[PDB]
Write an enzyme that holds these catalytic residues in place. Structure first.
Site, PDB file in Angstrom:
ATOM      1  N   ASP A 102      -5.298 -44.963  33.846  1.00 42.73           N
ATOM      2  CA  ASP A 102      -4.452 -46.144  34.012  1.00 42.73           C
ATOM      3  C   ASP A 102      -5.358 -47.372  34.045  1.00 42.73           C
ATOM      4  O   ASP A 102      -6.095 -47.583  35.015  1.00 42.73           O
ATOM      5  CB  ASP A 102      -3.633 -46.018  35.307  1.00 42.73           C
ATOM      6  CG  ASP A 102      -2.650 -47.153  35.513  1.00 42.73           C
ATOM      7  OD1 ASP A 102      -2.817 -48.229  34.905  1.00 42.73           O
ATOM      8  OD2 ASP A 102      -1.699 -46.956  36.308  1.00 42.73           O
ATOM      9  N   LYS A 158       1.900 -56.325  34.172  1.00 40.29           N
ATOM     10  CA  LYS A 158       0.824 -57.053  34.827  1.00 40.29           C
ATOM     11  C   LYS A 158       0.120 -57.962  33.827  1.00 40.29           C
ATOM     12  O   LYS A 158       0.781 -58.847  33.263  1.00 40.29           O
ATOM     13  CB  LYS A 158      -0.082 -56.032  35.530  1.00 40.29           C
ATOM     14  CG  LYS A 158       0.716 -55.013  36.360  1.00 40.29           C
ATOM     15  CD  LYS A 158       1.598 -55.607  37.452  1.00 40.29           C
ATOM     16  CE  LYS A 158       2.499 -54.563  38.114  1.00 40.29           C
ATOM     17  NZ  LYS A 158       1.796 -53.341  38.434  1.00 40.29           N
ATOM     18  N   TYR A 189      -1.534 -45.891  42.209  1.00 34.60           N
ATOM     19  CA  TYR A 189      -0.340 -46.681  42.480  1.00 34.60           C
ATOM     20  C   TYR A 189       0.759 -45.867  43.150  1.00 34.60           C
ATOM     21  O   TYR A 189       0.918 -44.677  42.890  1.00 34.60           O
ATOM     22  CB  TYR A 189       0.185 -47.322  41.203  1.00 34.60           C
ATOM     23  CG  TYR A 189       0.291 -48.819  41.321  1.00 34.60           C
ATOM     24  CD1 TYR A 189      -0.850 -49.592  41.451  1.00 34.60           C
ATOM     25  CD2 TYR A 189       1.522 -49.458  41.312  1.00 34.60           C
ATOM     26  CE1 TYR A 189      -0.779 -50.954  41.563  1.00 34.60           C
ATOM     27  CE2 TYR A 189       1.605 -50.830  41.431  1.00 34.60           C
ATOM     28  CZ  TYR A 189       0.446 -51.570  41.553  1.00 34.60           C
ATOM     29  OH  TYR A 189       0.482 -52.939  41.656  1.00 34.60           O
ATOM     30  N   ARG A 225      14.699 -46.033  14.989  1.00 33.43           N
ATOM     31  CA  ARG A 225      15.166 -46.262  16.335  1.00 33.43           C
ATOM     32  C   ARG A 225      14.772 -45.169  17.336  1.00 33.43           C
ATOM     33  O   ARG A 225      15.487 -44.872  18.293  1.00 33.43           O
ATOM     34  CB  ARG A 225      16.652 -46.620  16.394  1.00 33.43           C
ATOM     35  CG  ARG A 225      16.780 -48.041  16.663  1.00 33.43           C
ATOM     36  CD  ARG A 225      15.886 -48.251  17.813  1.00 33.43           C
ATOM     37  NE  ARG A 225      16.304 -47.446  18.936  1.00 33.43           N
ATOM     38  CZ  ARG A 225      15.549 -47.229  19.991  1.00 33.43           C
ATOM     39  NH1 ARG A 225      14.352 -47.785  20.078  1.00 33.43           N
ATOM     40  NH2 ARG A 225      16.034 -46.527  20.980  1.00 33.43           N
TER      41      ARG A 225
HETATM   42  K   LIG Z   1       2.502 -53.859  42.680  1.00 30.99           K
HETATM   43 NA    NA Z   2       4.437 -59.157  37.037  1.00 35.04          NA
END
Ligand SMILES: [K+]
Ligand code: NA
Ligand SMILES: [Cl-]
Ligand SMILES: [Cl-]
Ligand SMILES: [Cl-]
Ligand SMILES: [Cl-]
Ligand SMILES: [K+]
Ligand SMILES: [K+]
Ligand SMILES: [K+]
Ligand code: NA
Ligand code: NA
Ligand code: NA
Ligand code: NA
Ligand code: NA
Ligand code: NA
Ligand code: NA
Ligand code: NA
Ligand code: NA
Ligand code: NA
Ligand code: NA
Ligand code: NA
Ligand code: NA
Ligand code: NA
Ligand code: NA
Ligand code: NA
Ligand code: NA
Ligand code: NA
Ligand code: NA
Lengths: 388, 388, 388, 388
Positions: free
Chosen positions: A176, A201, A104, A51
């Site tokens: 990324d 995404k 981002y 865990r």
């Molecule tokens: K976004």
């Molecule tokens: Na999404």
């Protein structure tokens, strides 16, 4: 057999997964548990699952490691947690990061405000110019951080070239890879040390999971797990979210093919439209880094940006006139999503400040979904005609 | 009506929840989504749900805020993320924290190793002695951090007294209330500023969710959400986990009553057993801080520690001889869980070092579940008799 | 706008779904509830949702109705429940059904044993010969029941021709469209009255849901819901299963395209293999009803049967020699599944009896998945070479 | 050890469950799969899990069998499917059933309309009068069917006496034990052959699952599974629903204790209220079958009916005046639910017809939840005072 020997679609379906030895169940069981039990004192000592690990989540981690051609994977609560767990594992007060400026939003906030408050300094540069990366490196630089393609005009970064520079100067390269997914770009194969994704995404693809993944060497991932997650961010992915992401990623290959086929059609339509001043898409030969894109990316992606004639009010009228495209700030979903940053997300931001960030008043961003491209094009044409 | 006016059991069931206005559905719907859609450019600008928020998770946050008598709540990916999101929101390089030494392992690792690498200094003190807290405070001290009851011998901290000291010296008091749940202790009512929980334990109660919650003033929670989660840890709770926790917490009152009724019976049995040298339980009048416990806690809890005659090997033989109790390191589940730290979790730790941490070779910890207490007692008696 | 006007891929993604009006959530919320609440006595009387209905399940039902070009849909606990809820709604003691003999096993058991015990008589005929259907009709015949393509050699039934015959003689035509999905065949458009599916196969596609769907006229579906489900079978689909099926069906178009592209490649490989005596696949021009298939089906499907040289032992050796294909009795999953009925499912059935049912000793059935076809072909070649 | 030897609370928590042998996971994994895979041709033949079975669902079935002291259990899609799968397995055209008249609505519709259309005749009798059951039995009678307590005035049926009568005349006794749960009544221990439940009510208890369970002898359950479910109703429970029900039933003992403690308080309050003409509750000594209830039931239940002064309009005004109780037709949830049948469910039914069914114009039904009883009483008093 070993799924690392099989074709990429076969890996997408099978890597990290197998029928449950105990029951034969084909689907990876959902191990929605917090507690694991020992058979004896000795078994308890021996283990010291845990865990900070889980069988369902392990399957996802293993699968993504295979797809990125990395040693190991680590799932997280969100894309931002993948990024911060990575960077907070690697860096401590006094360290330095060179980052692309075209990154981002939340990542930018973390790097510009959070990191310096922990004594970790960040230099932002134009990563489309590898010389700016080189010039910004310091003896303290631990990480070079890049995103490619990058918002809002889908500019690129040359991963292989930047990796070589970072490594010569003693730093790790973190990429990324959210925009592309491992189906379309494989940064580790180009010299990157660590890849992060928001699985929110394309990897999940179904608009119903927030999550992240980190892929890299076993030695690093072990630190990201047993120190980063365990001690610092606590950003562990729930087993149900891991199961949904496993389910979503089964169709990654066929989804990416359709996203990109649709996006290329739409990009060409937009490039031929006299009310559209510019179209940003790596699949169009007028893209400034087109040839780099062709070497580094197997497909040009499912995202397009474009500028509509008539600035702010035209953009607003356009998004208010679509009937099929949905107004939302996400990407990588099965539905086509559209946004107009200057009126939607960056509305309180000063117009001249938006301009410096590459956000013009007429800029529209489109995440192309799995609908019939003729329907998406017809909807865009309808809205553009009205707006202009 | 307003659930803040109702009795605590009524609040447990209803607070933060209502039938779905749109459909009438009684159960809080599971909003398992990553994407929220706008009806227009204007609606998009107006909002700028968000997905640093979610309707299912909001219900849980609101409920726990009511139960702790706090203004607002914030759910997280884990108990450790509740703690680190809180402390990393509050503190930056140069700041200081005074912490109890008797705290959960991962918290201790975060405070002893992670915080100093970010330039945040921590002083550990015996929080059962409020004078040690006072003496350790510095001009830079932002937070006093405590847990009560605390492992491994269930010692207490006087919340009200410590709050008064922290506040006079300009610091916030953060209390980890995991052990008790809001049903048994309400630190904000005693002057604490912020309460954190691992909902992994009693709040969820069903051994199938890892998660945390933070409760405090709206102004602080807003920062923990929009900076802590958004920028720093990324440790957001999945909507499905929030839904399960909402479901689990419905029975919090009846569960805690039964846990504590069972634990008191078991503690008395153990105190009467000549093979058991010591029993640590706040419900026993020989507990060193018994009267404090009676003022601060509405019930003495579901956790017991005890020492078995014969040290390390007796403890090992005992846990290897139970048939009903399950060997596991968790607590707050519906099943009775048992562990012997000296052989299970702290086995590689030097015996003299274990002793300094209050972990004797014969110490056993028990998380009492919802089984018939006669069955739990019979199992313990069976194992103890064999082991000794 | 109205999704009935859009292209089929657009419908697959959007039909029956929309952002949640109340919250904007894009994903259909999971209304995992048993109870719906009224605002007043009057609202309660007015409704008398219900819970012979559910918002999540409604979305799925609406979507499938659009995809099959039917008026209404009804989700069920299983494919067999879709079939029996349909037939038990339509038929009572004294009624008659004419059924294809080439139908799914459980359906055959229901029709051959269960129906007659309720006084409902069934005549089985070769539905590839529409004259046999005509000849079997009686004044009491309420339903003609067919499946196409049909196991085990993928024979076809001419839906349009059979519909015309059934209707002239006053009966309804029910078609099990599981094999094809609405992406590849649309029986209602060819005159069928009711379509049933096991969504367990292609519609869900992810090997993790058992469920069914019925599509037809509003008047019939209302009876199937308010009498069939409510009173007779109780076979309602859980909201979570409906949500998963909604999620799975998002990729139906791209999945079916890839299944069929892969299957055609594999079928051609098998037809060229000298150790393979026969290959049954609608996409091969030597299929006995090839031209019918080209008119009635938009793609030839993802299922193939074939006969390996050397009978029973060769078939056994072959399935024991595959490394990628998984041994299982399901179809429509993302993984390639293989079975050898004579050794696996029909082993206790007398060899001469198997023969009459079209199951030869060397017959292998393959459900082609989404892996790279070169990998599937290589695995088959490996196993065939070893087995022969 | 064997959980059949342990106390009832211990069984509630542990029966049918154990840590996952493969992983140690304490929570029963969610085997959300449709497909099970074989390791060889031989293993496939040997099995011929199945998917007329599932490991998660098996755990629930085993647990409920232990709790009802039956041999075996079978989970279903709904309570009505438990009932119809049972009766359609047992009965064929020409058979007969003697049923209580005081039974759940959907059951009554199935028995009065559906069964006779399959040639299965049903005689309805007042099951509070065992002589009426005896008198209605025929040579063809296969089943006597009863529910106790029964709507709408919570009348009882003497299970032991009726079992003896059914058995002497060669019939099976089926009891719907939904109202009580196995915690409060155990019909098999009193001679019943088969018990059915809607787990939608108390067994799950959380208002978020529709499902049923059947418990009885292995020989019968095998037929209900391999013929009833497989061939006739298709009403199988989804693994996720089974997992939720397992989770819900963990707290069955503590929930039932609190439901009944609260209900007794509320019933006494109502009996003392001069605006309330009658109160129907087995815990009140004026209940017509009080002593029978004390022998047959360990607790008097969580359901109350009562008549308010002033008939139809008073009942309507009362339910329109509650602020805490929720207007809904379910029972067994953690929230208190209230309904006024004459205005809500039976509004279009003729007043004189409602009367014959025991539904008077002023009759209110209450499912007492887990809130503070003082809050429920205060809400009722508020509404009653206003309404009268
Ligand atoms: K976004
Ligand atoms: Na999404
Ligand atoms: Cl498309
Ligand atoms: Cl108990
Ligand atoms: Cl492929
Ligand atoms: Cl209560
Ligand atoms: K622990
Ligand atoms: K099958
Ligand atoms: K009801
Ligand atoms: Na695994
Ligand atoms: Na994780
Ligand atoms: Na413009
Ligand atoms: Na297309
Ligand atoms: Na909410
Ligand atoms: Na736990
Ligand atoms: Na959260
Ligand atoms: Na000792
Ligand atoms: Na007890
Ligand atoms: Na809907
Ligand atoms: Na399947
Ligand atoms: Na249904
Ligand atoms: Na052969
Ligand atoms: Na391919
Ligand atoms: Na099991
Ligand atoms: Na319910
Ligand atoms: Na079932
Ligand atoms: Na009255
Ligand atoms: Na109470």
């Amino acid at each position: 057999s070993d799924c690392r020997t099989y074709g990429f679609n076969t890996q997408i379906v099978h890597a990290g997964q197998q029928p449950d030895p105990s029951t034969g169940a084909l689907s990876t069981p959902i191990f929605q548990t917090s507690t694991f039990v020992f058979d004896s004192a000795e078994q308890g000592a021996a283990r010291f699952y845990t865990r900070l690990g889980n069988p369902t989540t392990d399957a996802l981690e293993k699968k993504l490691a295979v797809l990125e051609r990395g040693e190991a994977g680590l799932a997280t609560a969100s894309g931002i947690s993948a990024i911060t767990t990575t960077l907070l594992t690697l860096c401590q007060q006094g360290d330095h990061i060179v980052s692309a400026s075209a990154i981002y939003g939340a990542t930018h906030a973390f790097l510009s405000h959070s990191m310096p408050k922990f004594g970790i300094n960040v230099s932002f540069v134009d990563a489309a110019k590898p010389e700016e990366i080189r010039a910004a490196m310091r003896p303290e630089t631990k990480v070079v951080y890049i995103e490619t393609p990058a918002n809002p005009t889908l500019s690129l970064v040359d991963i292989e070239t930047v990796a070589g520079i970072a490594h010569q100067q003693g730093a790790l390269l973190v990429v990324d890879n959210t925009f592309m997914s491992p189906y379309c770009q494989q940064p580790l194969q180009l010299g990157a040390d660590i890849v992060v994704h928001s699985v929110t995404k394309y990897i999940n693809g179904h608009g119903d999971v927030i999550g992240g993944i980190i892929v890299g060497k076993q030695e690093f991932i072990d630190q990201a797990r047993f120190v980063g997650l365990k001690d610092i961010t606590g950003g562990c992915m729930s087993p149900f979210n891991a199961w949904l992401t496993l389910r979503g990623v089964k169709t990654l290959g066929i989804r990416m093919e359709r996203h990109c086929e649709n996006a290329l059609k739409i990009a060409r339509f937009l490039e031929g439209h006299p009310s559209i001043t510019r179209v940003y898409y790596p699949g169009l030969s007028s893209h400034p880094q087109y040839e780099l894109g062709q070497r580094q990316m197997s497909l040009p992606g499912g995202i397009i940006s474009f500028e509509i004639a008539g600035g702010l009010e035209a953009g607003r009228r356009m998004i208010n006139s679509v009937e099929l495209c949905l107004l939302a700030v996400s990407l990588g979903d099965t539905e086509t999503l559209i946004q107009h940053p200057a009126s939607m997300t960056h509305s309180p931001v000063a117009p001249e400040e938006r301009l410096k960030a590459g956000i013009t008043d007429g800029l529209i961003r489109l995440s192309v979904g799995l609908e019939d491209p003729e329907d998406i094009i017809n909807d865009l044409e309808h809205a553009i005609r009205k707006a202009t």
